[PDB]
Design an enzyme around this catalytic site. Structure first.
Site, PDB file in Angstrom:
ATOM      1  N   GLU A   1      -2.986   9.893  -2.414  1.00 55.99           N
ATOM      2  CA  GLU A   1      -3.567   8.558  -2.406  1.00 55.99           C
ATOM      3  C   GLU A   1      -4.117   8.165  -3.773  1.00 55.99           C
ATOM      4  OE1 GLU A   1      -4.676   4.886  -1.175  1.00 55.99           O
ATOM      5  OE2 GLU A   1      -3.656   6.360   0.084  1.00 55.99           O
TER       6      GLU A   1
ATOM      7  N   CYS B   1      -0.128  -0.018  -6.761  1.00 52.95           N
ATOM      8  CA  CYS B   1       0.148   1.091  -5.844  1.00 52.95           C
ATOM      9  C   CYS B   1       1.422   1.842  -6.205  1.00 52.95           C
ATOM     10  CB  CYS B   1       0.268   0.586  -4.406  1.00 52.95           C
ATOM     11  SG  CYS B   1      -0.901  -0.697  -3.947  1.00 52.95           S
TER      12      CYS B   1
ATOM     13  N   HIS C   1       0.816  -1.216   0.000  1.00 47.81           N
ATOM     14  CA  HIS C   1       0.000   0.000   0.000  1.00 47.81           C
ATOM     15  C   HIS C   1       0.853   1.271   0.000  1.00 47.81           C
ATOM     16  CE1 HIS C   1      -2.643  -3.146   1.654  1.00 47.81           C
ATOM     17  NE2 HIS C   1      -3.665  -2.428   1.223  1.00 47.81           N
TER      18      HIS C   1
HETATM   19  C1  LIG Z   1     -13.281   2.313  -5.724  1.00 48.34           C
HETATM   20  C2  LIG Z   1     -13.922   1.056  -5.160  1.00 48.34           C
HETATM   21  C3  LIG Z   1     -14.085   1.167  -3.651  1.00 48.34           C
HETATM   22  C4  LIG Z   1     -15.307   0.867  -5.798  1.00 48.34           C
HETATM   23  O1  LIG Z   1     -15.749   2.099  -6.237  1.00 48.34           O
HETATM   24  P1  LIG Z   1     -16.546   1.819  -7.789  1.00 48.34           P
HETATM   25  O2  LIG Z   1     -15.401   2.060  -8.704  1.00 48.34           O
HETATM   26  O3  LIG Z   1     -17.746   2.737  -7.705  1.00 48.34           O
HETATM   27  O4  LIG Z   1     -16.917   0.260  -7.803  1.00 48.34           O
HETATM   28  P2  LIG Z   1     -17.385  -0.117  -9.379  1.00 48.34           P
HETATM   29  O5  LIG Z   1     -17.892  -1.500  -9.173  1.00 48.34           O
HETATM   30  O6  LIG Z   1     -18.315   0.993  -9.813  1.00 48.34           O
HETATM   31  O7  LIG Z   1     -16.005  -0.218 -10.249  1.00 48.34           O
HETATM   32  C5  LIG Z   1     -16.299   0.451 -11.437  1.00 48.34           C
HETATM   33  C6  LIG Z   1     -14.997   0.786 -12.112  1.00 48.34           C
HETATM   34  O8  LIG Z   1     -13.943  -0.042 -11.589  1.00 48.34           O
HETATM   35  C7  LIG Z   1     -13.136  -0.297 -12.695  1.00 48.34           C
HETATM   36  N1  LIG Z   1     -12.192  -1.417 -12.387  1.00 48.34           N
HETATM   37  C8  LIG Z   1     -11.270  -1.998 -13.266  1.00 48.34           C
HETATM   38  N2  LIG Z   1     -10.534  -2.981 -12.712  1.00 48.34           N
HETATM   39  C9  LIG Z   1     -11.002  -3.035 -11.401  1.00 48.34           C
HETATM   40  C10 LIG Z   1     -10.637  -3.857 -10.322  1.00 48.34           C
HETATM   41  N3  LIG Z   1      -9.656  -4.799 -10.486  1.00 48.34           N
HETATM   42  N4  LIG Z   1     -11.241  -3.739  -9.103  1.00 48.34           N
HETATM   43  C11 LIG Z   1     -12.210  -2.767  -9.031  1.00 48.34           C
HETATM   44  N5  LIG Z   1     -12.670  -1.909  -9.956  1.00 48.34           N
HETATM   45  C12 LIG Z   1     -12.034  -2.068 -11.170  1.00 48.34           C
HETATM   46  C13 LIG Z   1     -14.090  -0.674 -13.842  1.00 48.34           C
HETATM   47  O9  LIG Z   1     -13.487  -0.536 -15.078  1.00 48.34           O
HETATM   48  C14 LIG Z   1     -15.108   0.487 -13.644  1.00 48.34           C
HETATM   49  O10 LIG Z   1     -14.700   1.550 -14.343  1.00 48.34           O
HETATM   50  P3  LIG Z   1     -15.662   1.715 -15.905  1.00 48.34           P
HETATM   51  O11 LIG Z   1     -17.099   1.782 -15.435  1.00 48.34           O
HETATM   52  O12 LIG Z   1     -15.022   2.958 -16.459  1.00 48.34           O
HETATM   53  O13 LIG Z   1     -15.178   0.436 -16.526  1.00 48.34           O
HETATM   54  C15 LIG Z   1     -13.127  -0.219  -5.568  1.00 48.34           C
HETATM   55  O14 LIG Z   1     -12.998  -0.389  -6.946  1.00 48.34           O
HETATM   56  C16 LIG Z   1     -11.699  -0.213  -4.966  1.00 48.34           C
HETATM   57  O15 LIG Z   1     -10.777   0.478  -5.402  1.00 48.34           O
HETATM   58  N6  LIG Z   1     -11.486  -1.076  -3.887  1.00 48.34           N
HETATM   59  C17 LIG Z   1     -10.160  -1.143  -3.261  1.00 48.34           C
HETATM   60  C18 LIG Z   1     -10.033  -0.051  -2.172  1.00 48.34           C
HETATM   61  C19 LIG Z   1      -9.369  -0.648  -0.936  1.00 48.34           C
HETATM   62  O16 LIG Z   1      -9.966  -1.209  -0.024  1.00 48.34           O
HETATM   63  N7  LIG Z   1      -7.979  -0.518  -0.848  1.00 48.34           N
HETATM   64  C20 LIG Z   1      -7.230   0.158  -1.921  1.00 48.34           C
HETATM   65  C21 LIG Z   1      -5.765   0.278  -1.513  1.00 48.34           C
HETATM   66  S1  LIG Z   1      -4.751  -0.787  -2.613  1.00 48.34           S
END
Ligand SMILES: CC(C)(COP(=O)(O)OP(=O)(O)OC[C@H]1O[C@@H](n2cnc3c(N)ncnc32)[C@H](O)[C@@H]1OP(=O)(O)O)[C@@H](O)C(=O)NCCC(=O)NCCS
Ligand SMILES: O=P(O)(O)O[C@H]1[C@@H](OP(=O)(O)O)[C@@H](OP(=O)(O)O)[C@@H](OP(=O)(O)O)[C@@H](OP(=O)(O)O)[C@H]1OP(=O)(O)O
Length: 320
Positions: free
Chosen positions: A122, A168, A105
């Site tokens: 971030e 990251c 991270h």
């Molecule tokens: C941001 C998050 C919380 C969800 O928010 P969201 O993006 O509204 O969730 P969605 O289901 O709508 O994801 C949609 C987008 O994710 C993109 N995406 C691509 N690869 C992805 C992946 N491996 N994991 C998640 N989302 C991904 C999709 O392309 C989409 O974008 P598009 O509509 O332009 O294609 C989630 O994706 C995330 O980042 N989780 C990890 C956060 C965490 O706990 N730690 C991060 C530190 S490493």
């Protein structure tokens, strides 16, 4: 499969195929990663390992970048307590408060020395899945605080450009380079932070995960004093060139100030390009399951992987 990323692959392949040592293995894994093959290894660890050899050639490429890799976030604090450069950027992994272990991270920190001012960017989100990133950021902030640095002069900026949990370090690196390339605005932010304030934080802090949690909880979840904001309001479009989400690109070009609606490639190009177009130029399907097929386009922008291939080409060309 995309022609741009494929072009990047064709650029890198010889350099890896000529490489020896762990860097050949790393480069091969990166080529596999980009090509759309399976990766039998975690890339946070790989990137973390081979970050230095990059950092070097990037410091060469852009003198004044002042990028540093610190094994801990305490080494950042140790670095702060020096009459070093007036402005430097550092990449470092967070530390688990209950174990004291480093947990990948990584984040980047744009730093000005003076009562020092720190800007943590971030790539993902401040809170996280199980409020983990939040309490980790809390540890970092607390330590920076007892170091002597006033928390009213530190700012964590959530960009949400990164959607994966693997990239990251590359996001941190591109964000370092871009923080150097966009030195002026950062200088503005720092001039602001010197007097303990952050531009448009009042509107822009709500647009972050941290904002939703602070509004849903109504008690301090992140440390009292530390500032925070959404990247699209305070950072230039450069920080979203590697956004995986095309919806994000669309929503960014649709902004009223139109800061994100400009051209995102160098002016020395026959074919122009904006955020959405770039996203579409690196648009590929993604690598999870068939039983769990997802809503919204399963696709995303693998531009960041291309950034990785780029860095590896630069290093491997630099060594030979
Ligand atoms: C941001 C998050 C919380 C969800 O928010 P969201 O993006 O509204 O969730 P969605 O289901 O709508 O994801 C949609 C987008 O994710 C993109 N995406 C691509 N690869 C992805 C992946 N491996 N994991 C998640 N989302 C991904 C999709 O392309 C989409 O974008 P598009 O509509 O332009 O294609 C989630 O994706 C995330 O980042 N989780 C990890 C956060 C965490 O706990 N730690 C991060 C530190 S490493
Ligand atoms: O990440 P950087 O270190 O800042 O590299 C950037 C950039 O990369 P980003 O996509 O991450 O913003 C472009 O490369 P592309 O991936 O868009 O193709 C660019 O090239 P163009 O604007 O002409 O398209 C060029 O890369 P290069 O060094 O190969 O010329 C440039 O770095 P420079 O400061 O050296 O121009």
């Amino acid at each position: 499969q995309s022609m741009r990323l494929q072009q990047k692959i064709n650029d890198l392949k010889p350099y890896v195929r000529h490489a020896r040592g762990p860097i050949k293995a790393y480069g091969q894994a990166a080529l596999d990663r980009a090509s759309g093959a399976a990766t039998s290894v975690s890339f946070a660890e790989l990137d973390a390992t081979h970050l230095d050899a990059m950092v070097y050639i990037e410091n060469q490429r852009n003198p004044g970048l002042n990028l540093k890799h610190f094994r801990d976030h305490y080494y950042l604090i140790q670095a702060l307590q020096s009459d070093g450069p007036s402005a430097f950027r550092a990449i470092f992994p967070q530390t688990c408060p209950e174990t004291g272990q480093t947990l990948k991270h990584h984040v980047m920190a744009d730093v000005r020395l003076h009562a020092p001012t720190i800007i943590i960017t971030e790539p993902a989100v401040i809170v996280g899945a199980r409020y983990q990133q939040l309490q980790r950021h809390n540890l970092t902030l607390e330590d920076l605080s007892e170091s002597g640095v006033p928390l009213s002069q530190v700012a964590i900026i959530e960009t949400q450009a990164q959607k994966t949990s693997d990239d990251c370090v590359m996001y941190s690196l591109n964000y370092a380079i871009k923080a150097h390339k966009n030195a002026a605005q950062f200088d503005d932010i720092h001039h602001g932070l010197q007097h303990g304030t952050l531009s448009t934080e009042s509107e822009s802090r709500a647009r972050t995960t941290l904002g939703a949690l602070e509004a849903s909880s109504s008690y301090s979840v992140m440390h009292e004093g530390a500032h925070a904001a959404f990247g699209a309001d305070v950072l230039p479009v450069d920080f979203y060139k590697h956004g995986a989400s095309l919806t994000q690109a669309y929503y960014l070009m649709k902004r009223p100030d139109g800061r994100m609606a400009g051209r995102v490639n160098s002016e020395g190009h026959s074919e122009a390009e904006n955020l959405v177009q770039r996203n579409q130029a690196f648009r590929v399907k993604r690598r999870e399951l068939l039983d769990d097929e997802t809503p919204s386009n399963t696709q995303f922008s693998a531009s960041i992987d291309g950034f990785r291939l780029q860095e590896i080409k630069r290093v491997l060309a630099a060594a030979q």
